[PDB]
Design a protein around this ligand. Structure first.
Ligand SMILES: *[C@@H]1O[C@H](CO)[C@@H](O[C@@H]2O[C@H](CO)[C@@H](O)[C@H](O)[C@H]2NC(C)=O)[C@H](O)[C@H]1NC(C)=O
Ligand SMILES: *[C@@H]1O[C@H](CO)[C@@H](O)[C@H](O)[C@H]1NC(C)=O
Lengths: 36, 98
């Protein structure tokens, strides 16, 4: 069922500072005490 | 899209050729499937020729204390050599040193 719920509701997009996020595991290998 | 034309009267090259391609990746992730090679017993504190999921080697086996995360199968040194492994049957962590 298609429903046309009003509109996009004005302009939401604001901005923020992503300090040190977005870090994921690059490979499926265990490592420790190393600056990879 | 353009239509293939395949009839038995066509010669070599124009005939249909069924193709199967495998796109498997190896040994930077835990193994899941392989051949009929049979598992043996486990021995420790002895220089032995181990074989864990296709990774041959030589060294003594000792129960290490490193906590392998479930997506992790291998542990590596500075020189990219394997250092610890999780046995595919018993999920304990074993140190490997030649
Ligand atoms: C939501 O909006 C769309 C377009 O604004 C509607 O699509 C129209 O549907 C009518 C029939 O009810 C057609 O005559 C128009 O040509 C359609 N417009 C377009 C641009 O395709 C849609 O029907 C609306 N949703 C509902 C539930 O009515
Ligand atoms: C592996 O599977 C066999 C039978 O499929 C079972 O007997 C054995 O206990 C399993 N390994 C472990 C470590 O439990």
């Amino acid at each position: 069922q298609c429903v046309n719920f009003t509109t996009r509701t004005q302009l939401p997009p604001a901005y923020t500072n992503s300090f040190t996020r977005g870090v994921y595991y690059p490979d499926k290998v265990f490592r420790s005490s190393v600056l990879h | 899209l353009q239509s293939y034309g395949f009839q038995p009267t066509y010669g070599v090259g124009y005939q249909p050729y069924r193709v199967v391609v495998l796109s498997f990746e190896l040994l930077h992730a835990p193994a899941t499937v392989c051949g009929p090679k049979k598992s043996t017993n486990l021995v420790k504190n002895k220089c032995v020729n181990f074989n864990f999921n296709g990774l041959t080697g030589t060294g003594v086996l000792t129960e290490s204390n490193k906590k392998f995360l479930p997506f992790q199968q291998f542990g590596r040194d500075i020189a990219d050599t394997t250092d610890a492994v999780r046995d595919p049957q018993t999920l304990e962590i074993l140190d490997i040193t030649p």
